[PDB]
């Protein structure tokens, strides 16, 4: 009944989550996806993994074909999409090695194809105005957090827990990302303003991925990996990048376990009313109709 | 002498403002307008109307040819442009069913052709840097406000009236819009930040329409219709939607009355000096000259 | 060992900084630069100048080919780029006639080609994520500031000096620019928000020029001229006073630039140039 797609970011350019059956090349009305897809199973649940940047990480965030990636997963029968993203921290209690199950974002991207619908021949005919106040699938968000608990990963909820209960590495139960266009990182001025706005992390790939998943009627949740992009500040930059990469490798191992546990938890529940509600929200958001 | 163009937004896809005298299928140096232009009279005042999204509302906000629409109206001899827009509220005193005669905006659009001038073969030769501190025609703004008073619609002016005088439904005598690119609505995170910046309403179509009107030497004023896009929060979304659409239908009836009265009020005054000043501001903003 | 490129903004459409020894009518793998590049010398220091908007100021900010301008200077062997920009003030102590040696910015541009690298067939292959926390070359920033001191122009550093040391016209030793896409100026609503964010000046041309210079392994520094774009509040006499002051500001910036080229050539830059190139290599994520 359910099928989980996985969009792997940095650290997942060469997917190896499960015992691979075969790789699959697909075409899409909006172009080719970033790479071939790896098809397999976790339990009795079909799973398919797609590297966001391609196998060698040769595609930058602004040039990723998010429409083709999301539609390819849709056409393969996916009902859910779990995604990863490496990010920088903007707040004290989010430190390298932590994870964030995001629930909000502020969009600073531009020049990317961010909708399936329009009046151009390269899009589906129609005008679609999708509500995005809470842009993720809340059921799928809580499954990622429960998967972390099941794998004995600390979970921190700043609305219900003291800052001393912040035990790293932890999964932050909530968080907002500012998605910048890249490829450059932010200036200190820009980072200060983003921090003053209360944003938790900065990344480059969440939007329009999260928006297109909802346009496709798919349940989408993202888990962000906090890393460190400031090794240029240390005196021994070569040692710093080695230490940050080693911690990032350990973070990828944790996220791999969370993703595998989440796929099983998704396949254990019924999603009939949620999938139907995902499809109806698309229909009701059609202004031309 | 004076000739009033009207750009009808949502709810005005079939404007139906006056008896059609001429129907003009127009071509501009910047492409085709959203639809055929309908020419006629309101009283003794010549008037031209076009629907921003075309018949059937097939054109989303980001793909409207704002240059062709404004240029076509200018080409037919318009001296003024009155425009409508359906918007969502960001502040407590702006309630669905109110109207706003906008006087300010913050631009968050991208990827739209926003100027007639440039160095490319498809633009007018020159470099134009237009002042936009107060981006509307103030005379024409006050015409819309007087038109509302003449049609016995409450007018609330926060500059001179207390919040106790805010009697709904009312026309707000001033207001600022954040224009997002669409087609999606804002996240809660984005709406919270726009509200913290003091913006009154959110829409998707004001920019670059207001900018191009001033580039063309035209007097531009907008009247926003506050409606409700958050029907998903409701227990029975089917019931709220019908209530919101019924309120929106009443709103377009009153906006039609305001537009027709505003056209008559424009025609009752001399605009020689204002038109002359509109044209002179374009010439004085040419940096290449 | 050094060669200084100069990108002249408004007021420098016909630069004329030195005797023209030669001209270079060139194009790049990313298109045509804004105009012919003019080669010469300041003392014994090689210099190249190009007008950002081309002669006659026919190219608006959003259509300037920043990639081609930076690449053409790099192609001629430039090690540094000094750039000028005319800007408006967002804060009370930045008054028309002042200058700013920028050290920060907030980017509100869009639709401009802003990187040499990517997966497109016509770009340099690879994924380049350059750090930009402090986006200018700091050594070159201090050269511009020292050049102003050497030309008898007041310098104001709000980190160490009370506001009583802000004697106009002055070079502000640091400052942030919000770069808007243009061509229109900001609404009062937008200006109020930019001011509340603490930004010092507003312009239209700094980004992506500063980003691409770092991608190219070049030392880049910008000197802004504060002028006044709000004479519509008055009329033609207001404009004439603002234009005369801007003319004087252009003369001052000309003296600053010529002294800066001499100060750059008087020092060794082997280490800094090698660091510029090593930062490009270490920012390649595909490697």
Author numbering:
A (entry chain A), B (entry chain B): 3 to 291
C (entry chain C): 3 to 236, 239 to 291
Can you provide the manuscript's text about this entry?
This enzyme catalyzes the reversible phosphorolysis of 5´-deoxy-5´-methylthioadenosine (MTA) to free adenine and 5´-deoxy-5´-methythioribose-1-phosphate (MTR1P). The observed overall fold of SmMTAP is similar to that of members from NP-1 family of low-molecular weight purine nucleoside phosphorylases (PNP), which consist of a central β-sheet distorted barrel surrounded by α-helices, as observed in other MTAPs from human and bacteria. Furthermore, a comparison of the KM levels reveals that S. mansoni MTAP can use adenosine with the same efficiency as MTA, which is one fundamental difference between S. mansoni and its host and reveals a potential target for schistosomiasis drug development.
The mutant N87T also does not present any large structural differences in comparison to the wt SmMTAP structures; the consequence of this mutation is that the capacity to form a H-bond with phosphate/sulphate in PBS is restored. An interesting consequence of the N87T mutation is the presence of two water molecules near the atoms OD1 and ND2 of T87 mutant occupying approximately the same position of N87 side chain. The bulkier group of N87 prevents the binding of water molecules at these sites. A disulphide bond between residues C233 and C242 was observed in the APO structures of S12T, N87T and S12T/N87T mutants. In general, residues 229–242, which comprise the catalytic residue D230 and the gate loop, are disordered in subunits without ligands. Comparing the BBS between bound and unbound structures reveals a large movement involving residues 230–232 (usually residues 233–241 are absent in the APO structures), and residue T229 presents a different side chain rotamer.
